[PDB]
From a paper:
ATPγS was previously shown to support the formation of human B complexes but prevents their subsequent transformation into activated B (Bact) complexes and/or their dissociation. Owing to the absence of the B-specific protein SNU23, which stabilizes the binding of a second 5′ss oligo in B-like complexes, only one 5′ss oligo is bound in pre-B5′ss in a manner similar to the 5′ss oligo 1 in B-like complexes. As a consequence, U4/U6 stem III, the formation of which is mutually exclusive of that of an extended U6/5′ss helix, is still present, as well as the U4 quasi-pseudo knot and its associated proteins RBM42 and SNRNP27K. In pre-B5′ss complexes, 5′ss oligo binding triggers the movement of the PRP8 RT/En domain (PRP8RT/En) towards the PRP8 N-terminal domain (PRP8NTD). This action generates a half-closed PRP8 conformation that is also found in B-like and B complexes.
Here cryo-electron microscopy analyses of human CE pre-B complex and B-like complexes reveal extensive structural similarities with their CI counterparts. The results indicate that the CE and CI spliceosome assembly pathways converge already at the pre-B stage. Add-back experiments using purified CE pre-B complexes, coupled with cryo-electron microscopy, elucidate the order of the extensive remodelling events that accompany the formation of B complexes and B-like complexes. The molecular triggers and roles of B-specific proteins in these rearrangements are also identified.
Numbering used by the authors:
A (entry chain A): 224 to 445
B (entry chain A): 1113 to 1168
C (entry chain A): 613 to 660, 675 to 779
D (entry chain C): 116 to 951
E (entry chain U): 100 to 555
F (entry chain 53): 3 to 79
């Protein structure tokens, strides 16, 4: 049947290593800020299209919202525009910066910044203070504002009470591979799942879903 | 006009008539005062002409 | 090609990523194949403006069938055809807005004629104003259709 | 499940607690873990978390919590029985934190949350400062502990040092905010709970000690927790906590015995299935089924951590240790929240939290029903027991003993006090427990106190709710067609009740203005208005910032206005307030209700003001909090001192009215030292017309402000933009475009990220976060909260060049065009008249 | 003393009477403690000191402002609010307090009840202003209010307040507001003949789930049925008095022995089989029949007498034909030709006949222009419907109290009604312009949309 | 971890009575409940076997001289 596959972590590690060429390095969904499907949905639901987003034919004529007559408060004589109200502003908050939003979609606000360090050299231990990580103040702090226990007067612990997980390597060779796979894209995040057909695996899919292939001719953009 | 026809909800400019051919900045300034005066003048004209002989 | 020739790779024709367009062509072929199969089956087998007219024909045919049910065609045959004449007469009697009274015809027959003519007049006025609205809106119409709509208006 | 209602009777088993979060995702994850532990029916899906605290669909779709969810259950404890925890999860946004302010009066204990990787944040610091000023217990929770373990993959010693640095920073912030001796927070003290909120991994030092005792031996968990919490070091040869650190290569007790096992378990699980072998599982004393092993890495880790680390007993123990019962904690809350004083007999009874005494319940939260037609007032019952059908008088936030008409009587239907299942089976609720009173929503807008009808005739409502944030972003609301204008207005009222921070004002220009704090806040307001409260489509205007009017120079000439009755004229001169006085007065440091000697001493010591000036009648704006202060410097040699005493109330009313409505844009005016020069008035009471003073007083205020140098003031918003190092300089570029000034910039300790504190003007703040996030290609993130009023460049009334209708004005011309546009939009005369 | 000592109270005059519109704050958008400006005429939710009302008093200079509930004009500019009985005309207008003894005086409409401004009170038939759209709903409400029993029931606020109002349903509050507005309109204390139905229209739209809203023109029959159902719901419910007063006033009862007669396509053998199976057996329907619905006969397709226009006037006996003609009805829109066999058993004291001239054809809805031809005199349809019921229905002489007739094209059409004061018998047109029109003036010539008569 | 000791520890903070082996019955609020049934209460009422009753501001009775204890009915659910 060849329908479901149950595999091991090192195989994902090596397959991800091989497929790094075809897979982008983006790991946090915040990179797809205004390029997720909901942003394009609410762009299509309106006349305005974001510069990175394609144009669309409006669903209806929408002559009512096309050119409204000047009103008592709608007059530009009173509206103050410090900065242009770009399409980014409208797409970000469709229910505020858009008169008569009507049928729109809701976009995800934010995702916590994925603080991950990709392994650079396999020989170096995984649980290592990477130079990119900011140093912390190793202050001596001779003061003792924090509570202190008794000095060699209590806390008689039995020798049979080990610190739980002992005689087991804290850092192993497979730790780096697994912790790197934990932040892989969708195909490699799953340890084991079901197969997909050959024709419905879009490799280029993750490419245009990115913000832009920066440094490209106009035809590539189009 | 307000005594004859009150406008508490400011619905006078709800169904106003304006020329859509002209651009937005010059077609018609639908200010509340201007709309109120237009409706008042139209009501005065309609009152000064009997509804039987003719109509506006 | 943009990516294949992104760096040290030459800017020549040496690009080999056919899967991306291969899947699209496979999907389009999958969409198309129902049409080709249907037409090939049609060949392999041996059998290789009407809305207003449809409703008018339905009205007249239904009224004629109802008359032939009521009128005993097994006995009287010719007069039934002449019945249709009164139909048309009644219709034009409605169009001219002139009085129409036929004492010779039976009263139930007159009631059936009245129902037919009221339905036909309602439909006729409806389609007349609908076609007039279509013409004035900007929809394209034919010369004969325009003349008929003008006559109805 | 009747034990849930049974435990509500025991006033000493309730733990009123409110949560806080850097981001709503972290706190809601913990709440969902608690719900799953308490309720075995609800299980979080592998794809996404349940997020039971996100009741609104807007929060579910956007991903940021919208409204606070006061939902929790009876939870067990390691060394104690089950206590009926009730937790009001709060949103994790800077503006939405205003909603959390309501929770400040719901409970007397804040279980603050701090992300391990992110560390201290602007929202967390603001919440901690507000809670310290609110006189509530603080128990910190190191959140997302797996981030340091997994995301950062930091060494265990480095992770412990980072956690200790975060705890030390929190303790320093708390000590700066409050000087109480209870500010000490540490795992040894029991004020720090390490709860990742992911994979159900929560514990304390006591929880780890109890786990050790259960695994083997009979070691006293309390002593072990007191020893292993800090860096006291462990000697294996001595086999004891040895503060001298005898072993050369040993690790600290917390690192060696607490962090190290968690790191080993995480490495075994994530590293490989063979790494987390059945042998390792047996060594850990867990036997997972084959199905659990066949799951993906994330579900397997979640199951392993949940099974290994109990059922969040450490958090319950920490809360019970420090967060007091309502009986104990009602007295400080009675002292703080109640404006009637704890010395009152009813106040004293409430301080004892007597269920059989008078009924005094304070409702401040407002929650819409499923149909949205009716509301329900959620609030704590300080004293008494509310019964279904029992009538009660709901005194509003503006209620006072002067007029009894400010309160109305209403009946209370079903209570629905229990919220975990959101059921309405509750019949009556005792004192000290949160009740969702139904049917009394109409008489009250927000923050109103219900009381028994005839039992008490002198009890008054608690003090009005106060917020740290200030609503500065104003937006106009109009219907698409006026034909159904009232319907939208109905929804507008539903907006005012639902969101305490939102302020709906009917401007004189016939425009309904909504005042909010942040752009996302007003966006959520409008979404709720259109989708739920008023289905009518609503047209809006471009967001505008409420402006202030200030002075820089003293008045050139005195300004006098004469009362119509026999020409009684008062003359005054306005001067700019002393530097630094505005924020001091606005911070409730000194109140007008203070004794004259105390205020004089304060002014002579801090600001070195004259004692005679201090002894003058002082107004200090509306509610003694307005930065624009008024001092009655009238010479005692004049015979008007008796007249001034007979006209002090009218003068104060005129001054507060002028403070609320200024001469330019009729907006709020701050930092104005209005000096009442003198007043000549006939002593006859007939000539002392009450209505002849306040208009004259505000005319004098306007003339004095015109006489002095007038300036516009915009609210500079503090923004703590966190961004990766590479984009940091580019981030400044964004502030370059939006007229922003960088105040500080520091790297995140223990994290590659980098925080930048900047002061962005509100005029350019609209969409600043969007510009920062898009320009940085979705990497940088920002969060802006109003910080302080700053004087805008230019002169409001100076004759300047009229700006183009669609072109930004030059910096010197901003003030005049701001003033003219605000005056015209408000509906008042655009041109500023010196004579007027 | 101080309530009238202030000269501002004399200076405060009723320049504009905006109490017809909904009572809400002009600056706070709140209905709680909304004091109205006695001189300026604007209602704000603020108080007399340090609030919106204080600002209004210090700006408009109106030292007097009526209270939200007690309607107490501010005796002092800010100190105290005590009204003066000298200008109590507005207080009486806003507070309908006509008891049964005073209702008898109100029932004595023969007296010239000149309003405050000198207009005609017209109890129940006041030419109040109507919305531009859905004016048929306003006409139906006025015709319902034209009954002195309706005004008496509305004025019985204590009786109205006796029924408990469930918090969940807003129907009771809307019904109470509409009844209060109707009582104020019928009260002699009113000042302006034209009354704004904006509050009434909003209440009707909100209560009826936007059905028959004032935004668009609504059918008179549907609006009347919805209003009757809402009134029945307001008075009926969980209380022991299940029979609502509004419902029981115009309930009625038809003992329609409905027969499921066989379909026309069924032959004689199938008809005999169905009869043996008791298919065409008459079954009593016991229909409520709150308002009788009498349908006009077929329109004249071809004009015979006068080709320009033929008006087939329907005799009033057609309505009275429901005793046997409706009992002989053997017609249905379903496949089976249902035999209605309608038989009205108990005739309600109030007879509300709906012509239902509008009817949907296969393409468009058209109205029969046939004349009503209904004389205004005694009737005997109740005796015809049930001969034995004549003893129970002693007062069979019912006169058409109020008749409303549509006018104009079905798309852009309006309505006009004529109502007669009970006892007085003025029979005047309720139109604002044509207040006094006693003679029929070919009233039955137009297609009367609906008629309302009292058994008397 | 016993079921009866856990029920006695969970019953702390409520009104309960305890009859000792000497006949003295002390009823009051259980302030602290130990693992060995040592109960420390505050503001309790103690009635001896002779019938004399008294009030104690704070007491602590060990489980060795305690016979039985009766808690409230809220712990049954």
């Amino acid at each position: 049947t060849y329908q479901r596959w149950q595999f091991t972590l090192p195989m994902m590690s090596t397959l991800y290593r091989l497929a790094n060429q075809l897979l982008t390095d983006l790991v946090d969904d915040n990179y797809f800020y205004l390029f997720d499907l909901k942003a394009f949905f609410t762009s299509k639901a309106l006349n305005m299209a974001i510069p990175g987003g394609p144009k669309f034919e409006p669903l209806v004529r929408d002559i009512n919202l096309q050119d409204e007559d000047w009103n008592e408060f709608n007059d530009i004589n009173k509206i103050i525009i410090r900065q242009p109200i770009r399409t980014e502003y409208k797409i970000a908050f469709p229910y505020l910066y858009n008169n008569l939003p009507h049928h729109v979609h809701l976009t995800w606000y934010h995702t916590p910044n994925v603080v991950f360090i990709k392994t650079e050299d396999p020989d170096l231990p995984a649980f290592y203070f990477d130079p990119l990580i900011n140093p912390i103040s190793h202050r001596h702090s001779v003061k003792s504002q924090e509570p202190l226990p008794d000095d060699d007067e209590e806390f008689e612990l039995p020798e049979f009470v080990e610190p739980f997980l002992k005689d087991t390597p804290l850092y192993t060779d497979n730790t780096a591979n697994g912790i790197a796979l934990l932040w892989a894209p969708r195909p490699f995040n799953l340890r084991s799942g079901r197969t997909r057909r050959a024709l419905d695996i879009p490799l280029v899919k993750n490419w245009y879903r990115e913000h832009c292939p920066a440094g490209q001719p106009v035809k590539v953009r189009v | 006009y307000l005594t004859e026809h009150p406008d508490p909800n400011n619905e006078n400019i709800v169904g106003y008539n304006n020329k859509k051919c002209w651009p937005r900045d010059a077609r018609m300034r639908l200010m509340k005062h201007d709309v109120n005066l237009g409706r008042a003048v139209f009501w005065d004209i309609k009152n000064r002409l009997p509804r039987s002989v003719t109509t506006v | 090609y943009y990516r294949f020739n992104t760096g040290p790779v030459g800017k020549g024709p040496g690009c080999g990523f056919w899967a991306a367009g291969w899947r699209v062509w496979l999907f389009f072929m999958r969409g198309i194949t129902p049409l080709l199969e249907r037409w090939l089956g049609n060949l392999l087998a041996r059998q290789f403006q009407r809305v207003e007219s449809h409703f008018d024909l339905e009205l007249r045919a239904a009224v004629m069938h109802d008359i032939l049910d009521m009128m005993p065609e097994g006995i009287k045959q010719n007069k039934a055809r002449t019945i249709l004449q009164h139909l048309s007469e009644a219709w034009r009697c409605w169009k001219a807005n002139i009085p129409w009274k036929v004492p010779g015809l039976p009263t139930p027959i007159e009631n059936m004629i009245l129902r037919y003519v009221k339905a036909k007049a309602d439909w006729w006025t409806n389609t007349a104003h609908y076609n007039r609205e279509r013409i004035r809106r900007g929809a394209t119409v034919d010369k004969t259709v325009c003349k008929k709509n003008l006559g109805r208006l | 499940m009747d034990f849930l209602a049974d435990l509500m009777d025991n006033s000493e088993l309730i733990r009123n607690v409110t949560l806080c979060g850097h981001l709503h995702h972290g706190k809601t994850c913990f709440v969902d873990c608690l719900i799953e532990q308490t309720h075995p029916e609800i299980r979080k899906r592998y794809d996404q978390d349940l997020c039971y605290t996100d009741i609104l669909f807007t929060e579910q779709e956007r991903g940021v919590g919208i409204k606070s969810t006061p939902v929790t259950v009876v939870l067990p404890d390691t060394k104690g029985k089950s206590y009926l925890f009730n937790i009001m999860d709060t949103p994790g946004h800077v503006n939405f934190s205003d909603e959390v302010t309501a929770g400040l009066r719901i409970s007397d204990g804040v279980v603050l949350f701090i992300d391990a990787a992110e560390g201290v944040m602007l929202n967390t610091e603001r919440l901690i400062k507000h809670a310290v000023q609110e006189r509530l217990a603080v128990t910190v929770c190191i959140n997302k502990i797996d981030r340091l373990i997994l995301e950062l993959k930091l060494p265990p010693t480095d992770a412990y040092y980072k956690l200790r640095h975060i705890v030390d920073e929190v303790n320093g912030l708390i000590s700066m905010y409050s000087t109480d001796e209870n500010l000490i927070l540490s795992p040894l003290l029991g004020n720090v709970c390490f709860s990742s909120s992911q994979y159900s991994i929560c514990f304390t030092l006591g929880s780890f000690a109890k786990i050790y005792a259960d695994t083997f031996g009979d070691i006293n968990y309390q002593e072990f927790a007191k020893r292993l919490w800090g860096d006291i070091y462990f000697n294996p040869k001595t086999r004891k906590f040895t503060k001298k650190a005898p072993t050369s290569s040993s690790q600290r007790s917390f690192v060696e015995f607490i962090l190290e096992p968690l790191y080993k378990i995480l490495a075994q699980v994530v590293g490989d299935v063979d790494t987390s072998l059945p042998r390792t599982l047996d060594e850990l004393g867990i036997h997972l089924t084959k199905e659990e092993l066949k799951l993906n890495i994330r579900p397997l880790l979640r199951l392993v951590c949940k099974k290994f680390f109990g059922e969040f007993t450490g958090f319950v123990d920490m809360c019970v240790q420090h967060i007091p019962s309502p009986k104990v904690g009602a007295k400080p809350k009675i002292e703080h929240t109640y404006t009637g004083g704890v010395d009152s007999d009813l106040g004293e009874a409430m301080s004892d939290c007597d269920p059989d005494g008078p009924l005094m319940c304070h409702t401040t939260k407002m929650y819409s029903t499923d149909d949205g037609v009716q509301f329900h007032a959620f609030g704590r019952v300080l004293s008494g027991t509310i019964h279904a059908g029992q009538p009660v008088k709901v005194l509003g936030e503006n209620y006072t003993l002067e007029d009894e008409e400010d309160s109305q009587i209403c009946t209370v239907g079903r209570l629905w006090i229990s919220v975990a299942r959101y059921h309405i089976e509750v019949n009556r609720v005792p004192a000290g427990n949160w009740v969702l009173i139904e049917g009394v929503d109409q008489p009250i807008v927000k923050t109103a106190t219900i009381t028994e009808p005839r039992g008490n005739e002198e009890a008054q409502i608690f003090r009005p709710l106060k917020f740290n944030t200030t609503s500065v972003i104003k937006i106009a609301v109009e219907p698409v067609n006026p034909s159904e204008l009232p319907k939208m207005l109905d929804g507008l009222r539903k907006v005012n009740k639902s969101y305490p921070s939102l302020t709906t004002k009917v401007e004189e220009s016939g425009e309904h203005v909504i005042l909010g704090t942040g752009e996302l806040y007003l966006d959520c307001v409008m979404h709720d208005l259109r989708k739920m409260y008023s289905e009518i489509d609503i047209k809006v205007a471009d967001p505008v910032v409420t402006f202030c009017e200030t002075v820089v120079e003293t008045s050139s000439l005195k300004c006098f206005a004469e009362t119509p009755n026999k020409k009684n004229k008062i003359t005054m001169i306005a001067e700019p307030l002393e530097k630094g006085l505005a924020e001091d007065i606005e911070n409730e440091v000194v109140q007008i209700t203070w004794n004259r000697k105390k205020l004089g001493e304060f002014f002579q010591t801090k600001y070195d003001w004259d004692l005679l000036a201090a002894r003058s009648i002082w107004a200090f704006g509306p509610d003694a909090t307005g930065p624009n202060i008024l001092v009655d410097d009238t010479l005692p040699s004049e015979v008007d001192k008796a007249l001034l005493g007979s006209v002090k109330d009218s003068i104060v009313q005129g001054f507060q009215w002028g403070t609320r409505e200024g001469p330019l844009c009729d907006e709020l005016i701050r930092n104005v030292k209005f000096k009442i020069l003198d007043a000549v008035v006939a002593q006859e009471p007939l000539h002392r017309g009450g209505g002849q003073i306040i208009p004259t007083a505000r005319r004098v205020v306007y003339s004095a402000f015109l006489m002095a140098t007038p300036r516009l003031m915009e609210p500079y918003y503090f923004v703590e933009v966190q961004a990766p190092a590479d984009c940091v300089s580019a981030v400044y570029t964004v502030l370059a475009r939006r007229r922003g000034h960088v105040t500080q910039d520091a790297p995140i300790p223990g994290s590659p990220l980098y925080t930048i504190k900047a002061f962005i003007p509100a005029i350019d703040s609209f969409g600043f976060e969007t510009d920062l996030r898009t320009h940085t290609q979705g990497q940088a993130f920002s969060l802006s909260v109003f910080h302080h009023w700053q004087i805008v460049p230019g002169d409001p009334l100076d004759k300047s060049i009229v700006i183009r209708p669609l072109e930004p004005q030059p910096a010197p011309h901003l003030a005049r065009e701001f003033m003219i546009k605000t005056r015209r939009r408000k509906g008042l005369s655009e041109d500023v008249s010196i004579s007027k | 003393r101080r309530s009238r000592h202030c000269p501002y109270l004399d200076t405060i005059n009723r320049s504009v009477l905006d109490f017809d519109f909904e009572k809400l704050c002009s600056i706070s958008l709140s209905h709680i403690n909304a004091y109205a400006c006695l001189v300026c005429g604007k209602y704000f939710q603020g108080r007399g000191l340090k609030s919106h009302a204080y600002i209004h008093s210090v700006q408009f200079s109106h030292h007097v402002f009526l209270n939200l509930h007690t309607l107490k004009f501010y005796c002092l500019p800010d100190n105290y609010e005590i009204i003066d009985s000298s200008l109590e005309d507005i207080t009486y207008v806003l507070k309908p307090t006509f008891t049964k003894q005073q209702i008898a005086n109100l029932d004595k409409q023969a007296k010239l009840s000149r309003a405050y401004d000198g207009t005609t009170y017209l109890p129940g038939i006041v030419g109040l202003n109507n919305i531009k759209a859905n004016d048929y709903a306003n006409a139906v409400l006025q015709a319902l209010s034209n009954v002195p029993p309706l005004r008496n029931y509305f004025l019985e606020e204590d009786n109205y307040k006796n029924i408990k109002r469930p918090p969940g349903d807003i129907m009771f509050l809307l019904v109470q507001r509409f009844g209060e507005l109707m009582r104020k309109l019928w009260n002699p204390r009113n000042f302006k003949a034209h009354v704004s139905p904006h509050e009434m229209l909003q209440a009707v739209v909100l209560c009826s789930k936007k059905t028959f809203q004032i935004t668009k023109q609504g059918d008179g029959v549907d609006f009347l049925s919805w209003f009757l159902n809402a009134l029945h719901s307001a008075l009926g419910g969980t209380k022991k008095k299940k029979k609502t007063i509004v419902t029981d006033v115009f309930q009625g009862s038809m003992r329609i022995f409905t027969k499921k007669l066989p379909h026309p396509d069924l032959p004689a053998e199938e008809k005999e089989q169905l009869l043996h199976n008791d298919e065409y057996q008459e079954t009593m329907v016991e229909s409520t029949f709150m308002y009788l619905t009498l349908d006009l006969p077929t329109a004249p397709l071809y004009k015979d007498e006068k080709e320009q226009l033929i008006i087939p006037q329907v005799p009033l006996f057609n309505i009275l034909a429901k005793f046997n003609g409706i009992t002989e009805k053997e017609y249905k829109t379903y496949k089976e030709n249902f035999l209605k066999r309608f038989q009205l058993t108990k005739l309600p004291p109030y007879l509300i006949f709906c012509i239902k001239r509008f009817t949907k054809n296969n393409f468009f809805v058209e109205k029969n222009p046939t004349i009503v031809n209904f004389p205004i005199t005694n009737v005997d349809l109740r005796e015809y419907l049930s001969e034995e019921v004549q003893a129970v229905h002693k007062n069979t002489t019912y006169d058409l109290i109020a008749n409303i007739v549509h006018d104009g094209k079905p798309s852009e059409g309006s309505y006009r009604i004529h109502v007669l004061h009970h006892g007085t018998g003025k029979w005047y047109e309720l139109q604002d312009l044509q207040v006094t029109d006693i003679l029929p003036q070919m009233i039955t010539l137009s297609e009367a949309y609906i008629q309302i008569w009292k058994r008397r | 971890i016993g079921v009866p000791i856990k029920v006695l520890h969970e019953a702390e903070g409520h009104i309960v009575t305890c009859e000792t082996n000497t006949g003295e019955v002390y009823r009051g609020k259980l302030i602290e409940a130990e693992d060995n049934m040592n109960c420390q209460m505050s503001n309790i009422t103690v009635t001896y076997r002779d019938g004399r009753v008294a009030q104690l501001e704070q007491v602590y009775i060990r489980g060795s001289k305690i016979r039985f204890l009766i808690l409230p009915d809220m712990l049954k659910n």
